[PDB]
Amino acid sequence: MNLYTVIFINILLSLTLILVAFWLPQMNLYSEKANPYECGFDPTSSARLPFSMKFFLVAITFLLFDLEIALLLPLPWAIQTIKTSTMMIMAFILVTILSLGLAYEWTQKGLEWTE
Amino acid sequence: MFFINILTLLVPILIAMAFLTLVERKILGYMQLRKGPNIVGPYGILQPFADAMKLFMKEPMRPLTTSMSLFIIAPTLSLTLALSLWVPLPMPHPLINLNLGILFILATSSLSVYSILWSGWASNSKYSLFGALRAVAQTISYEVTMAIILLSVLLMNGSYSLQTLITTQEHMWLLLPAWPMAMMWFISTLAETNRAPFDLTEGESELVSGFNVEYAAGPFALFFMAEYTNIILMNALTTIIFLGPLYYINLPELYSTNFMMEALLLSSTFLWIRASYPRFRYDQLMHLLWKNFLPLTLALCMWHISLPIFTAGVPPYM
Amino acid sequence: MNNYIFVLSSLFLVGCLGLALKPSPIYGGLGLIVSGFVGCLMVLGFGGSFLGLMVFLIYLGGMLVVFGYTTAMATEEYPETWGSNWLILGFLVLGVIMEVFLICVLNYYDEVGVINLDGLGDWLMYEVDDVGVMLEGGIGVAAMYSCATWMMVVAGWSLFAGIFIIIEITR
Amino acid sequence: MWFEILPGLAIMGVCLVIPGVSTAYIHKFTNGGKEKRVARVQYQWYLMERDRRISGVNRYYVSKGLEN
Amino acid sequence: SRAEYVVTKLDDLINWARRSSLWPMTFGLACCAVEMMHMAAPRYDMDRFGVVFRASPRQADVMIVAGTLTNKMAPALRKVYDQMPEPRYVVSMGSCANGGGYYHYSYSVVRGCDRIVPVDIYVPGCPPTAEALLYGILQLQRKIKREQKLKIWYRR
Amino acid sequence: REHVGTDHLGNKYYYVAEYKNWRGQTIREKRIVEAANRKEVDYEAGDIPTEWEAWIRRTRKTPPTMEEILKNEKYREEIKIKSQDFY
Amino acid sequence: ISAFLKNAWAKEPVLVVSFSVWGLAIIMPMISPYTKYASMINKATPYNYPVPVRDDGNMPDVPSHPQDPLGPSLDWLKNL
Amino acid sequence: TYKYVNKKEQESEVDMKSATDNAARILMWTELIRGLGMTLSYLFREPATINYPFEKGPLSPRFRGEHALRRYPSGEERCIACKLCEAICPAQAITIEAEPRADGSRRTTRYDIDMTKCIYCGFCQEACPVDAIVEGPNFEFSTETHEELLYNKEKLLNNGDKWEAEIAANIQADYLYR
Amino acid sequence: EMVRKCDPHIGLLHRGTEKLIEYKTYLQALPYFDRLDYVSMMCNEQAYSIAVEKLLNIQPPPRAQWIRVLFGEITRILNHIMAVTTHALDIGAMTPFFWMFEEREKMFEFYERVSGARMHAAYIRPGGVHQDLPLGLLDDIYEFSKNFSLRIDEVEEMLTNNRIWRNRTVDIGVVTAEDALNYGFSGVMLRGSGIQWDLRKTQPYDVYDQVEFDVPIGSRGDCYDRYLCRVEEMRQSLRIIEQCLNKMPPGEIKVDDAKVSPPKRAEMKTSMESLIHHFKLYTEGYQVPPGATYTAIEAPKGEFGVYLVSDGSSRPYRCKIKAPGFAHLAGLDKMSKGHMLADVVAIIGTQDIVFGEIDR
Ligand SMILES: CCCCCCCCCCCCCCCCCC(=O)OC[C@H](COP(=O)(O)OCCN)OC(=O)CCCCCCCCCCCCCCCCC
């Protein structure tokens, strides 16, 4: 109940600040004020056109590494096991596999950016 | 009474951030050979409130090309998460004792990125999109190593609960066993808060302003408030994890004071660095992390898996 | 507090329906993050902590990458939201009202078979080791490092080969 | 000089020490002189529930000694 | 005392906030921008008066027109002024901007920024001394100090 | 610090040479004013005697003598008269 | 090929330290004399009720009281 | 004569001590710590900022500021409508129209300087044969409306009267250099 | 964020300086040259003065030449501080800007004391300098110069060996020597790629032939190299300032030919010839012989040149100013290839440009 209460109070505080901000100041709205901004000269195209990403490979690699962090996180409870040999061996294997994958992607110029 | 506790945890934190703005400006001034603010009240103590007032009283803007939904949501989310992350912290007794406190912090901070992302997309402006995608790159950098750093220190902590760290550091700081982890953690916090040198998501030089280019008045105020709350939060997290304060069950206030001292010093160090150093190019930030921090972080993770086993020092669960 | 888990599940269904109506991928990812949060809350209510926190963390990262790709590749000049097209809006509202009607129909037809709006919340958690010590899902998930080692072996190979696979596909 | 940084830093320090002290004192006051019990595990929750049922006032912090 | 008294004090607080925190937009067109930089420099330190530069016009208050306003530039200046959120003020520094300045009789130069935007404070010079621009900023603060917006509404 | 003058308007001037404090940081020399009002916003040109400003900005090497200013009060006031005669 | 390692230590120190600590992590558990004690301590940590066993008269080793001299002893941990 | 700023030196300078030094520099962020130390050194210095409004920066006797029209000590106006200032002004701000007074002297019916067209060069006080037009030490005269910056004869003469003593002192200080 | 193509759109500060000058006398046109490169004012006006003196066949006096070189080098300190510090700010590092703008303020104090204006001085005029140095100015300049070394060393401690600075500048905007020459770059842009060149040495003017200094020269032809050259050039300029301070000669400050230089005011108030000369010089102005010339000086940004055409009248016929930035910024598209927006942000600084001179 307490976590819910504190988070709801935070949400209400933020929303109240937003409402004050949007309903206190004097508003004069016209098209030039409401148009996008680009350093003084009108836009030449939309902002919704495709915006090529030069780090897509490392994005997907970040997905994979996030899941491997996922595999690693149970370690604080695991270390309490009675089969310490197996636990340590398996953790070493997992970390070594992570490192070797990173090394392969490094040597194949994967962490570099397309141009 | 829990509501009184909520007030006593939120109001002082908001005031602390408000005055962190002034402290940053004055420290930068005195380090750049100028006095900084010193007119708005004695020694410029009213400047934060003056600026907050001005921002909340300046017109709020709804540009015609914006997705008003996310445009209004993302700032609110930013401030909400900034305030929320303070909940689980033990100083020394936490407002909310979560068993998986560190995982809570990780998940909430990771969600903070979506405020920047959605704001940058909703602005529907070119610089805003640049900022959002640079934030994507910054997160892809820091998170992978942040998680392993916390895991490596947790292998000695014994559990994911933050309150356990006090008892773990009852005799010494975690820094001494794991300064190598601590420095990477410090740089990673620097990156996470979007602070300089890694201040790329709002690189005033390259981009006039990142996500917050179309945001003005109170929404922009909310973004800034979330930023300077997160600075203090991360410095507090460092103070708790490493740089352990002193806990004497009879004298909690000693822990409270030691924590305030160390957190203030580290938060000042943030501004010190901001003034000292230039900015990275976000490709160079990503390379820094992935090709320097990540290898060493992984190697230290294996080292800290081994150390409990071969030192016969596995920590107690519970 | 009796309808808590049912309300969470219903909100999850609403989020998944929004995803199914396949709006612009940005708003789809937003709805998916909301659904992930709801699922985390459901798991926590059932008492599993690690699993719920875990989906939340993993999918914050995953939907970040999804955002990156959609804005780099899956973008139109005029992205379509739920309310952009009356077809999608009408079928969204229709989904809500039809699901409510189905819930009521099942409730009346059989009050116990599937949905039991009477006594909702009575049958959530069945048994608990009141004096037990380790019961949290963390231990069960840590079983991978000791007993279900084959499981971690297959998962780790999956990720390892995944790295090579994506490298070659993106070549 | 550099002494003029200290004012705002003093306001900082007071506002950052208030939370911990306040929460500690509130916990003690609202749990009857003893810092809040922690239920990291179902066993501790069971003990706290037993204390609540034994108190006779439905408060876990109210304790009963050999006199009972 | 009276609703007038409370409204006057509220207006005083409003203007105290606005004048104590005013953020010039990073606009600079010619030499006079150099003296603006010097005003930013340690010796005078604009920040001391609460004045801090911001890049996005969306987050600014005062536009310091520093330099000549060429015909080619005029549309951009007008749009950034329009895109600034209200309340907003315009400070004109240098002869280049107050009027045509040295280049007043030229075919390209707009004879004064006041023609393209409504000006509040005119700072003369060539370049106006950083001290002169600081005095102009204080003058603008005085102008804000006398606003009576809330009072005019209540009497309205 | 030193005092140097309290003009008719009310402003008080000081001179402060170079001194080095505790650690000998070497505080730089100053020529300061203390005005009738201690708020910067309320400062308007002409609040300071024109002669006094000179020594503040180092154009005038030595501080003015109040009588010297008093003469300036004369000439300025009645110079507007003699020009009315001479057309 | 000591020159290779030494130039690596000069130009790319991070990789060298990473590989070195990786090797040390793999090696030390075999070298260390205290490795045996980890599993013994984990087994010692008693997290479940020690269910008593019916005394059929053919059980000399198992004790009849916690304070009896028979059964497991944890003095090796008490002065590990 | 030349000097290479960044000439590449020697590639064979290899020692265990030197490699350790380089690795320590890389891993321990030595230069970054050095920069932090430099910034801290700055922190504790006296700030150079001047409490502007009550403390004003140095100005020399030659300062070129606000134009002013002096008077002869008797009360006569020094300007005799020679118009050299108008002829020379690079920006064509001065406009003068003069007539012969009753006595027969030259006097300016109107003397107008457009201070928004003036570039404060000083060529007017340079070329005034009777030291009539002088650019006073004042620099604080920002106005709230464009029409107040179009100075006229009365405004210029009043400025001269107001700043006479300091204008006179600067002129005595400087005339030898001129 | 890859920059495929760069298309500068200049002229947003074009004010028709060159057309205006055709309606103004030579002295009346001198102030225009302060307004061009507004961070190297005195060097600009020195270029104009040299051109006009070349046409007139007049030679400035020794003390005037020595003062002109002294203040040209002080102006070079100003410009190089501006370039380095604004480059640092643009990259991200900000403290050096304030640290060195304090020194720039002191230097503006010297400017004002000698001319009466902080910048846009209009001091160096055809035929010498307007007024002689005020007493004590040399001593104050010496006091400034004896300590400027500490400030420059501190800035170098900040940025030179910084790994962040090195990563953000080194190997950025590489320009080969042949392409530099062909594109028409000048000054530090050439000396960074390694072309040994400096007008002060190869084509001397004023007393530069009598002052000893070194010309820093690059090696890798990148932003880091050019920044190093700029810093070392500030040091060499300090050397030259010392030389000038010790070598200031006595004498007059303007050519004693009242048909080109205005007479002394005291004499103008006594001698008829002086009064007539003052009158005609400040009205019609001196007449320049019919001719045409091109003069160039190593302005702090590069080779600043004016192609002046005279038709025998008191007003110039055609004045074409070669801003060293006009050739530079054109090569922006070439320099920024395969580099991203941040690297472009940086490359703009190294070109060391003021749009006043670019647009004229
Ligand atoms: C006993 C057996 C077991 C023993 C195990 C222990 C083995 C020894 C391990 C020693 C290594 C310690 C960890 C060092 C991590 C440093 C990573 C690194 O190598 O530096 C990366 C970078 C250097 O720059 P760069 O040249 O790009 O590096 C690549 C060169 N090819 O450096 C950078 O990233 C710097 C750029 C960011 C600058 C951020 C500003 C920081 C300012 C200083 C902070 C000072 C305080 C830090 C302490 C915080 C405490 C909480």
Ligand code: SF4
């Ligand atoms: S007003 Fe004068 S100093 Fe300012 S930009 Fe124009 S010409 Fe240069």
Ligand code: SF4
């Ligand atoms: S200072 Fe120069 S521009 Fe101004 S009025 Fe005098 S001559 Fe004309």
Ligand code: SF4
């Ligand atoms: S130059 Fe002097 S005397 Fe001649 S018109 Fe001008 S002010 Fe009068």
